């Protein structure tokens, strides 16, 4: 329907002005993307090298890349071939093209997630509410086959069946994989994926504030200094009577 339900505001640890992303959370969120979301959603603008120094070491990211096979070539015979992935490779696309994607999803197209957080009003609050917000259709609502009721999705009828649930995956750090925990980490990861400059911009923001905190009062003092000559000048009119 035309009614809208806006996501509430969650207290993300990166919500504050000077608050960085939680990198352990990004690490788990990537695992969620890797084990769950990647079978239907591409992440076209993220490569394995991007994970290095953010949530995985270079060696760990190299091992992750190697878990997959990517087409390369042509070789000397003009043939394309498969090889283990490497750091420079971008995350593998689940489908060759959006048509295949729709055909494999009852006509619906799983969007690319590289920017999903920035491409939706609500950002991670929206993705988190959507992911943990599936419920049964309200009385009087009947969805066509293939659609699921999700009160946070525009129109409330989404073509993605609930993708996460308790124990949908096992985390590398033992963290209890409840649905909400899984949603929170994947959302954190999606934020990073959409804005890898996130932590850096806030650190520069801190320096910018500190510099302006110094320079503004100093320049203002210079302004007042120069202008004092005009601010205290006195005028007298002495026409000959």
């Amino acid at each position: 329907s035309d009614l809208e339900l806006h996501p509430p505001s969650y207290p993300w640890s990166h919500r504050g002005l000077l608050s960085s992303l939680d990198h352990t959370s990004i690490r788990r969120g990537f695992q969620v993307y890797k084990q769950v979301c990647s079978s239907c959603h591409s992440m076209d603008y993220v490569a394995y090298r991007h994970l290095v120094g953010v949530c995985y070491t270079e060696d760990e990211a190299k091992a992750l890349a190697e878990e997959v096979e990517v087409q390369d070539g042509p070789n000397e015979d003009g043939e394309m071939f498969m090889r283990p992935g490497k750091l420079s490779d971008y995350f593998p696309k689940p489908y060759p093209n959006p048509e295949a994607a729709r055909a494999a999803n009852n006509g619906a197209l799983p969007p690319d997630l590289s920017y999903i957080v920035r491409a939706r009003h609500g950002g991670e609050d929206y993705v988190f509410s959507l992911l943990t917000g599936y419920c049964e259709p309200p009385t009087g609502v009947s969805l066509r086959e293939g659609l699921y009721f999700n009160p946070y999705f525009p129109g409330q009828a989404i073509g993605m069946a609930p993708p996460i649930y308790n124990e949908v995956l096992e985390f590398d750090d033992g963290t209890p994989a409840t649905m909400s925990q899984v949603a929170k980490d994947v959302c954190t990861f999606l934020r990073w994926a959409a804005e890898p400059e996130h932590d850096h911009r806030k650190r520069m923001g801190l320096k910018m504030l500190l510099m302006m905190g110094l320079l503004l009062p100093l320049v203002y003092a210079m302004k007042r200094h120069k202008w004092s000559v005009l601010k205290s000048r006195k005028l007298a009119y002495r026409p000959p009577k």
């Binding site: 000077l18 990198h23 995985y56 070491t57 801190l206």
Partner: peptide, 29 residues
């Protein structure tokens, strides 16, 4: 001094969240 001081403040505000803070758990060269 400004850069180091600012970074320290930033890293303190974000204690345990940055890669530099959890990095040891995965390295060991």
């Amino acid at each position: 001094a400004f850069d180091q001081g600012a970074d320290a403040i930033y890293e303190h505000i974000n204690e345990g969240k940055l890669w530099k803070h959890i990095k040891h758990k995965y390295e060991n060269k």
